[PDB]
Structure 1
Amino acid sequence: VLNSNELEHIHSTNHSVNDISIRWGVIGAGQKGNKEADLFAGYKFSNGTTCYPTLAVNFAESDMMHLQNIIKEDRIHFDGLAARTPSVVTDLFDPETNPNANGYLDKLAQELGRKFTNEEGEVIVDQFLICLGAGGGVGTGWGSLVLQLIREQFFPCPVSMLISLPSGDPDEINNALVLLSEIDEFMREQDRLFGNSDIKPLANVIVNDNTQMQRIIESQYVNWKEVANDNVVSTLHEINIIPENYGSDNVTYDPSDLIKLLSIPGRFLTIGKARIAKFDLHSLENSIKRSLDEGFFSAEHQFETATMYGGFVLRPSNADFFKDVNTENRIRNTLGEYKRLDEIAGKFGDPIWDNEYAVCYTIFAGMTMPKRYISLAREGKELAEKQEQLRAEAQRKQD
């Protein structure tokens, strides 16, 4: 499956795509998470093997049945009863409600053995990628449970969470808020318990905002969710392929650099994918600026709080514009406007590939809570009043 023309152009070109920088183990909870997970499950190497071991987790037999790359065996469901909400979902893994918790919890763990470990016993995975759509019951709940679980040291290795922020429904935007709050707290506890050099149990959290993503999609059938998913998932896959499979005459972003970036900072992380086809300094600047501020991973991030950077421009073989001093400190200065590269750890490469255009990936890690959190807090309470008041204005009229 090839859900971006970058992936198309590097599978027709390159038939040595036999490894990736980080061996993710993907788990998708809730409907959104399931769908993203289903995309990951589809990706294969040039030889035909699957790239990522993937599980789908949900409430119901029902929820999971139109998946395409996830075998039925790997569709894990947990009978519920009752209200579908983040809090009563968490509490099915807590004998504080279910006598079935110590079984339920020792079921998940034996589907963790089966899918991400060998016959031998050893784990076949560097970190877990947990996909969620904040707002729903099942997804948001799983989010909280995961925080709780990684404090039980339930997982063999670190956990990266790919979380999506809800569009506009006061119940959803409140659910989303309590999760994002739980995350901010956990990240602050993690900062006091682990060194700046140590591997963090919560590797990072990557957010997308559903409002920002729709805005974009209606500019460039038309299911917007299906398209949003293709973009975020294909982007993460791309940045995982590239360091393992291409290098540079000037500066290579290797897989170790990417692993450090995703492993150590342990807070909020963002990505900017910018296509480039004008080979000049202005169109370069805008593309980068646009991908960072008005792209799929933009949620009014606090770039000044970034503790690490990474990135690379995949460029054509002839292209000696991207080596150049202007070009280099132009990028250095363009990215410099967000966080001054001189003040934070990182590296920025320029790999070669068999194509005649260039794509520029930018990653900032270690950031603090994104400002979308505040504007959501605002926008949820704003539409909350609107609807309570509507309610009353309808009841008034009747009476």
Structure 2
Amino acid sequence: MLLNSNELEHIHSTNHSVNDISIRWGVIGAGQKGNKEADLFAGYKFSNGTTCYPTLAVNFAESDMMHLQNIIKEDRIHFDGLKGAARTPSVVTDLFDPETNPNANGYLDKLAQELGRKFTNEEGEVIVDQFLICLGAGGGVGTGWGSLVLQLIREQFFPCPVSMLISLPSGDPDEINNALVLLSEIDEFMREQDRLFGNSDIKPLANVIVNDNTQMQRIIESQKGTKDLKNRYVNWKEVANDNVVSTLHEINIIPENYGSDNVTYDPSDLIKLLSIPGRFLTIGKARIAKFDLHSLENSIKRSLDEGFFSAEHQFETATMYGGFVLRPSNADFFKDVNTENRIRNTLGEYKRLDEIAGKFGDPIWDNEYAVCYTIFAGMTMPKRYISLAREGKELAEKQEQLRAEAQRKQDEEK
């Protein structure tokens, strides 16, 4: 268990029966980023110190996996032999493709194996609910795997659905491409399946969660760090991560361990919520320590807008909503209805919930502020896609410039 939020604390300080989750994610962490996250996920144990999620970490080589603080070598999968690579994801693919790599398959086995190892007990049962695959884009490894997975799922190695945690980078046109295309492909896929399935079907691809780094850094600095001191010694990712994960984590806990005396969110919701939309999903966590409609709105707005996962996704491309407000039970001001209404309406502004599926919870806690967790799902494409698009152009060219300028510098010299 790693608390790392007031909240978390609050929780933990309060309940200690926390031994219980909603969804058994099978954390496969790929690439620096993923791994890194994974360790955090890894950090969760219960109120009996029992891990929460089961986690494999993958990376190409061993060394790659040294700084992990929870992962053991066994869970450090790597495939090794050749030194160096071109960070093309095409390396990866090879290694499992007979044609390039005959022993392709050899590897696969071991994956299948370790999967077995890790995800069976001895019922041979998969002890997983959905695969949570974590990726940071531009990471060859990730990218390679990404696709890989798509196949694999098909190839039934994966019989749980996949949830994709994708970070959208910042800069570097190359990455941009890699990413975009990656996203594209996915997107296709996404599109295919709904019409390939019904639309009430378990989506093998449950949803996609994206994060923008850029945005985040900005945010991060926003939040200053004279509010603490070691802040003054931190890395943004390091923080970022915390939030991110925590959120997720948290929300998994909360319904499970909490109740309300009024509307009750629940796992199933989540399940629903997570599977079926199949697409782009976003979450807003809003501290609410100030108590009025206007501010409510603000923080709402803020939370959405100045959401952490925010990517300028196109709200009305959502189809489904969710979230809940964990509110103190003495917090009358919320008990009031107007509020609710207000809220409703508030949200309605980005698209009216009431045209789509979703629900909302309002749990109790005994905190001294409330946090509103908000989730919009099944969206398609965030405008960032575009922005990215534009930007890498605006980059590409920008160093074309630099290329031409200084091609001139060649000419200019004897």
Give the TM bin, normalised by the shorter chain: over 0.9
Contact kept, 8 Å, 1:322 with 1:350, in 2: the verdict is no
Residue in 2 that maps onto 1:191: 194
In structure 1, how many angstroms separate the alpha carbons of the residues matched to 2:215 and 2:370?
A: 25
In structure 2, how many angstroms separate the alpha carbons of the residues matched to 1:222 and 1:387?
A: 31
Contact kept, 8 Å, 2:26 with 2:55, in 1: the verdict is yes
In structure 1, how many angstroms separate the alpha carbons of the residues matched to 2:80 and 2:182?
A: 23
1:53-92 C-alpha deviation (Å, 9 max, x unpaired): 0111111112110001112211111226331112222222
| Range with bigger deviation, 84-93 or 342-351 | 84-93
Q: CA deviation at 1:293?
A: 1.3
Contact kept, 8 Å, 1:30 with 1:132, in 2: the verdict is yes
In structure 1, how many angstroms separate the alpha carbons of the residues matched to 2:380 and 2:39?
A: 30
TM-score normalised by structure 2 residue count = 0.94
Contact kept, 8 Å, 1:26 with 1:55, in 2: the verdict is yes
Q: CA deviation at 1:311?
A: 0.6
Residue in 2 that maps onto 1:28: 29
Q: CA deviation at 1:380?
A: 0.7
Runs ≥4 residues deviating over 4 A: none
Contact kept, 8 Å, 1:90 with 1:141, in 2: the verdict is yes
Q: CA deviation at 1:151?
A: 2.2
In structure 1, how many angstroms separate the alpha carbons of the residues matched to 2:244 and 2:76?
A: 22
1:218-274 C-alpha deviation (Å, 9 max, x unpaired): 110120111111111000001100110111111110111111101111111000111
TM-score normalised by structure 1 residue count = 0.98
1:351-377 C-alpha deviation (Å, 9 max, x unpaired): 011221110000111111111111101
Residue in 2 that maps onto 1:225: 237
Contact kept, 8 Å, 1:314 with 1:360, in 2: the verdict is yes
1:180-236 C-alpha deviation (Å, 9 max, x unpaired): 111101101111111222111111110001111111001101201111111110000
5+ residue gaps, structure 1:
none
Residue in 1 that maps onto 2:226: none
Contact kept, 8 Å, 2:65 with 2:76, in 1: the verdict is yes
1:140-169 C-alpha deviation (Å, 9 max, x unpaired): 222221122122222021110110001101
| Range with bigger deviation, 231-240 or 323-332 | 323-332
5+ residue gaps, structure 2:
224-232
Contact kept, 8 Å, 1:59 with 1:80, in 2: the verdict is no
Contact kept, 8 Å, 1:213 with 1:295, in 2: the verdict is no
Contact kept, 8 Å, 1:203 with 1:266, in 2: the verdict is yes
Contact kept, 8 Å, 2:44 with 2:52, in 1: the verdict is yes
Contact kept, 8 Å, 2:37 with 2:245, in 1: the verdict is yes
| Range with bigger deviation, 82-91 or 349-358 | 82-91
1:296-347 C-alpha deviation (Å, 9 max, x unpaired): 1000011101111111000112112212221001111111112211111111
Any idea what SS the aligned residue of 1:21 has? coil
Contact kept, 8 Å, 1:167 with 1:210, in 2: the verdict is yes
| Range with bigger deviation, 47-56 or 149-158 | 149-158
In structure 1, how many angstroms separate the alpha carbons of the residues matched to 2:13 and 2:155?
A: 45
Contact kept, 8 Å, 1:250 with 1:323, in 2: the verdict is no
| Range with bigger deviation, 96-105 or 47-56 | 96-105
In structure 2, how many angstroms separate the alpha carbons of the residues matched to 1:10 and 1:304?
A: 34
Contact kept, 8 Å, 2:4 with 2:242, in 1: the verdict is yes
Is 2:74 aligned against 1:62? Answer: no
Is 2:170 aligned against 1:153? Answer: no
In structure 1, how many angstroms separate the alpha carbons of the residues matched to 2:360 and 2:39?
A: 31
Residue in 1 that maps onto 2:90: 87
Residue in 1 that maps onto 2:228: none
Correspondence for 1:115 among 118, 123, 129: 118
Q: CA deviation at 1:134?
A: 0.5
1:1-37 C-alpha deviation (Å, 9 max, x unpaired): 1122211111111111111111111011010010011
Contact kept, 8 Å, 2:330 with 2:366, in 1: the verdict is no
Contact kept, 8 Å, 1:31 with 1:139, in 2: the verdict is no
Task: Name the count of aligned residue pairs.
Answer: 399
Q: CA deviation at 1:383?
A: 0.4
1:107-157 C-alpha deviation (Å, 9 max, x unpaired): 111111111211121111111100000112112222221122122222021
In structure 2, how many angstroms separate the alpha carbons of the residues matched to 1:327 and 1:346?
A: 18
| Range with bigger deviation, 80-89 or 17-26 | 80-89
User: 1:283-298 counterparts in 2 under 5 A?
Assistant: 283-298=295-310
